[PDB]
Design a protein around this ligand. Structure first.
Ligand SMILES: COC(=O)/C=C/c1ccc(O)c(OC)c1
Ligand SMILES: COC(=O)/C=C/c1ccc(O)c(OC)c1
Ligand SMILES: COC(=O)/C=C/c1ccc(O)c(OC)c1
Ligand SMILES: COC(=O)/C=C/c1ccc(O)c(OC)c1
Ligand SMILES: COC(=O)/C=C/c1ccc(O)c(OC)c1
Ligand SMILES: [Ca+2]
Ligand SMILES: [Ca+2]
Ligand SMILES: [Ca+2]
Ligand SMILES: [Ca+2]
Ligand SMILES: [Ca+2]
Ligand SMILES: [Ca+2]
Ligand SMILES: [Ca+2]
Lengths: 268, 268, 268, 268, 268, 268, 268
């Protein structure tokens, strides 16, 4: 019936020079047997931290329920802290805080070393809300070879995030050529035009689930996102449901995301 | 428990010079008591006729169920034939087939004279799928004072419809001034910009429900519609659900449209 | 299991010099057997008429459901039109439109003459919403011998009602002496203080059910009403539920009202 | 699915010079994982002590049920003893028994030190019945920066509370200037008029839930409370349900209070 | 809601020189409204007549139940008599009894003239068991333009059906050159090999549903049927379920057959 | 009531010269009491290994559910790895990898030594999908005295398996005489033709359950298999259901397989 | 969900000079937390002992069920042995066996010292069947200050009990003065007539629940009991249900008795 959540553990980070918090959900029966589990990475929005999906998202109750009902297979859920010191998911322009490198080169290997994890792309999915939707969306466009499924909920656009990366950086130390380079790497249109054939095929191979409420100011951002993906022939599932920019929407979508990624993990 | 459907009745049209077919759904208890009912106009798509919402849409079973369960209050459903002679809902460019004039000046008054109908805008709503979604959309943008609720399902765009009016017309007799004028009356951007305040207020006061499946080729048209409406401050409900250009989608949506318009008929 | 509604029947009034509309709900089985039924008079709000409880209140579906479930015993529901010519339930101050006289001397005797009605006080109740809630409240305070139960929903106060009576009157024909007298007859504090013992006792014998939503602008009016009745030792049931000034509130309250008066008609 | 209750633990009070009893409810799964929880302070009425909400309120069964069904998120419930030595929640006028200082400077820090509590305003709510309803009400009017939600049930008034503080004080040592000072601090009208703008805004930011039975002698006090709050534009949810001054009323409201505060803890 | 069955009606047949019996199931509500219905032709097995699907198949109960639950749309079910005079569905080789001619030239037009039928191939399906399963299959391979859906249940093969045609014939009147041709028209391998592209494509457009129990002596014939169709790229739905050559098997498949054809009639 | 899965335990093979992986499912309550269990050996398909039925087949959830509902009696499920070094279940022709000998002489004795197993043929069954369906089928045809029930799901044929033995072997060291010898040992027709009466009788005593989806490319293989068994009077259960070569099909059949073998273990 | 029963524990009795057996039901969760519980003393009938309510009454299942459903709050149930040495609940007339004194001075204090019991009259109730109905009835009439609720089931009368006390005694050492005094102390009419105002008011404060089946030989005794209590204005609930002198009756009443006493323990 019931799994458990740890909120106070950390990963020793040399790239960020600190102990980084994360939360982790372990499914019921993680402590019995010796088997391993797939992992869902679940990213919070602006203002919250690694307790957001725990306290507001009610991840323990919602995942316990979905797994016991058979709506989802057992999985591990990992919730990073992207609020302490700097807010956001990407490497800053001044070179002083490379959070994206921390995620792929330190957090993911730590999870695989510490917990009983199936450590392959086919067992790794990523999702998030608002700021974390943009995080999940662009993590997968940068490293499509790391994920099998991606689920941006109420996702911010590339322009919003690049604005956050500039406001968070010391712009006196950043040249104009470097601003132009990262601006292009945070634009969904430019990434798809400039991707080599191998990259674009991995992007088409990823299973995408993109959802947003219709009374959300981000509905326009996500309708433009849907049109861009069809224009580049990236098949995906797209939902615009009754809802707003609120935790009512995200607690309702969480079991849908789990059912979506769980079927990819188990195949069908 | 059970209402009834008549498929074979006609209305004698002076504008079109012929008897025009329609099907009509009367709710259960229509023959008991003396009260009157609100009306939903339900328009078919390209290739089908007045039997379309009857045979494919299964209107009798679905409305019988929604009304018996209380999801919808009792109402009349009218399904006009827009297939015979010429296909489409609008006046052709050559002046030989003014179907839109027929709808508003002959069909609606005939229904209100023949059946026990509450003959007011506050009790009159319109919906349709594909070609009929574009019909419901542009019928309401032309005569916004005529409806309280409008529900385009998988609706075609204005450019698609204007192309249909050209194909069906004798363009040898049509001047370039008329071609340019009618295109502007079939463009939603243009109508909203050229409307006086009294007209634009009535368009915002209409309660809109716009729904389309994500695996439909029209999903892009309807996402662009959602953006255009927001840009002009037309509040509306927008849904993009899992589904395609098929009768599974429209039979799923029919009881939603009925609950949507029923709450407006009864207030809430 | 389905009853029926007549909307188009009238009653010939000498007091008002015209045919006055009413609506009537007859329970299932009215046309089999020869028995008689109690009556609930159900009053609409300002701007609406005798169709209001039919179309907005959905009286037919709600009454059919409550009687078939046994939540209520079978009863007749009468819905008078207090909208045509003048809006309101009371005698105008200029003497040209004595609606309250019509209600008690012509409508109530007519209903008892035309339909199979148990014509005693113990089988007659009155209820209404907003304007009609104030109507029901003061109809019973003026003629307490006429009802066994009274249920004001979201009721306006006497001050609101008196103000509305003046606007509809030709105040050139009205003396200040009559204005002060009528003001006192539309004030609950005055009526309870100035009633002889015989009248005040009948007021206490009536079973009162007073309900209003907390997000209603009339919530303060109805809280003051609860305090006044307690201050004069008039027992009543009082409900302030989650809700607003809406037909969602009043369609919810109709089955509670029907269970309330039904239990009094049948005893317990 | 079962949590647990501790009744026999105490807090060592420097202010009251004794070990002070409290009861605490820990939710299911409190022992597994390392996370923290929000806290609801739940105050008993006159005559009961820290065992009242346990034995009469049946907090363990009711909270176990609401949390397992998902009607509430997991929370900690703390039940202070306000009966031993003196009955009541406030500082006595003679200076020998400052229970209110005890509550805020000793009990709240003790809970946050001893249990895994999210120790912020946004994760702290307070509720109580009768005497404790007034206690919850005026604790929050005195220290509004401490709470995010307040739920007085069948609450006693400000005058009743000030009367208790006097009967419980030795008045020979009490000056007349102080009596008038505390009289004003235990009056809601006085507090709302005389609070500076920063306090008054914080009172409006709190989420209020006020409930009382219609057959309670205190129904008048709480209806006057409803009117006073609207007069000062402090929005709140107000309920007057069928019920009396009884543990039937309070056992029914306990899960409604839990759902109310839980939605505030989790956001929506 | 119950439909009805007529057993005793006949069609006056010039080809067979007699009145031919049939049974017909008309759905609930056939006698209200004026609409039309699709038709399922339902063929009995050897030894039975037009009462077989009525008395043994229990078509009234099964069709009333499937239609009311919404598992199937309303349809007409026609059950021809192929037992009187001679047993079988095909023209006997001696030219004296052209039952296949009777079915397509007299029975189908008579049903369409007498009942409210949608008279098009897109609204016409055929099914049967054993002898009638072979009948449905070879009717559709001979006249593929007549059906949209075909459902042989526990069908006999072409050789068994041809052998029955010989044994019932007067061989004094049979030419051997025609006998050899008809043997080839009653062999599925031969029909598909000899079909021109227009015929072969129409056969692939028909929707096939082939079902047979695994404990049936005919399971081998129907597995070979499945192998032949795939060898010729005729996509179809094939079911081998637990069951025998019995009315337990056929009563279970009848609602499955109805759901299969209903969705094709209504589209999806 | 939850059982448990072990994935990381091995068996020391003298025949294969390495530690060989397997997974094992132990039912709930295996750790209470001293009783013994029957065993189902469950073989994966090509490309997966011993975690395939665990991660994709979800054996833990599906077996936990079937046993708790009583659809199946408690049993042990053993899932061997036939992927490492060489893919497949049979002895290679070059003599370097005799996997079939390993299975019967090392793996089965190890399970019976290590876990509480009823070590008799009447308590031993075998099943699998695709490559593993052929494994189960030909494992049972070679040593039929080892199993009481066999369940090939979507099984490959013997020719498919013989092709795998050739492609996986170094054929330079293999004589033509040996190629002909094993070819005959991997053909179902040949095995049944040459079996002595004792072997043939035990094959008929085995209870066979053969299931395949109709939209699977292997459906022709299994229809031919059904025909072959009937020609040799090998009674069996045969199912052809709606489905493809997918884990939806195989997760659906696993509880059907468990119910089938459980009923044989317990008798009926 | 499940509590537990101890049958083999004993109280060391100075009054009876021996270890006395009792059985005890502890509710689920007794071993978690530190809280205390109310106590129901539950007395057996003639012939049974402290195992009677356990084996025949099935108290463990019935109390587990009533408490888990919330029909009763958790309580401790103590079942004393009144069978060993002498049968009955009262002091023998010869002074050699003061069973009633043992009950009040040794059994009740031992329970409160040994288990976590709320040791006040308001948390103490008594019930019993047959002989134990008379015991519970007359214990409460003798020591009314000890109980808050009393529930005699199918109770014997005082005359029967006094007959039991004599037959169990050595009457040669008992004077006629003691015989007459005890007869009056075991008669319900006499106890109520001679009780001072302090005792009679506590008798009226106790909540009584007296139940007996209609086909029971004691139905007449308990009808007279109902008559006696009413004549002295002792309010009580009285039930005469279908049933006999059997454990079907007493197993039916046990959850009613638990609900009755629970609501007194919790208030309502
Ligand atoms: C319009 O785009 C934006 O302004 C993005 C908001 C934003 C940007 C950087 C931050 O560090 C931050 O944290 C408070 C918020
Ligand atoms: C881009 O717009 C189009 O494709 C027009 C399709 C079309 C238009 C008019 C018709 O009468 C019609 O009938 C078959 C089809
Ligand atoms: C109207 O105000 C009142 O009556 C105050 C009642 C009261 C006050 C203090 C107490 O310690 C107490 O103990 C029983 C009762
Ligand atoms: C005729 O069927 C075939 O070709 C069998 C496919 C096959 C055979 C052996 C393998 O080791 C293998 O590895 C991926 C695949
Ligand atoms: C009918 O009157 C009676 O018999 C009194 C019952 C009774 C009395 C004393 C006993 O020791 C006893 O144990 C069997 C039963
Ligand atoms: Ca899709
Ligand atoms: Ca909305
Ligand atoms: Ca509100
Ligand atoms: Ca009341
Ligand atoms: Ca079988
Ligand atoms: Ca298929
Ligand atoms: Ca009886």
């Amino acid at each position: 019936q019931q799994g458990k959540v740890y909120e106070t553990r950390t990963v020793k980070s040399k790239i960020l020079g600190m102990e980084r918090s994360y939360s982790i959900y372990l499914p019921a029966g993680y402590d019995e047997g010796d088997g391993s589990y797939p992992v869902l990475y679940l990213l919070h929005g602006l203002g919250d931290n690694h307790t957001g999906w725990v306290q507001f998202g009610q991840v323990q109750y919602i995942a316990d329920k979905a797994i016991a009902e058979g709506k989802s297979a057992p999985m591990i859920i990992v919730m990073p802290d992207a609020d302490t010191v700097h807010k956001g998911y990407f490497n800053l322009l001044d070179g002083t805080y490379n959070y994206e490198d921390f995620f792929f080169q330190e957090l993911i290997p730590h999870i695989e070393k510490t917990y009983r994890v199936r450590a392959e792309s086919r067992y790794r999915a990523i999702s998030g809300l608002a700021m974390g939707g943009g995080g999940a969306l662009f993590y997968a466009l940068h490293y499509p070879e790391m994920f099998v499924a991606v689920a941006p909920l109420s996702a911010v656009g590339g322009a919003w995030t690049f604005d956050q990366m500039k406001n968070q950086s010391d712009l006196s130390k950043v040249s104009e050529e470097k601003k132009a380079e990262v601006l292009g790497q945070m634009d969904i249109q430019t990434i798809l035009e400039k991707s080599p054939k191998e990259k674009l095929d991995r992007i088409k191979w990823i299973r995408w689930y993109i959802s947003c409420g219709d009374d959300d100011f981000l509905s326009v951002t996500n309708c433009l996102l849907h049109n861009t993906l069809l224009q580049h022939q990236v098949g995906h599932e797209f939902r615009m449901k009754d809802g707003s920019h609120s935790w009512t929407y995200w607690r309702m979508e969480l079991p849908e995301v789990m059912r979506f990624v769980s079927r990819i993990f188990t195949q069908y």
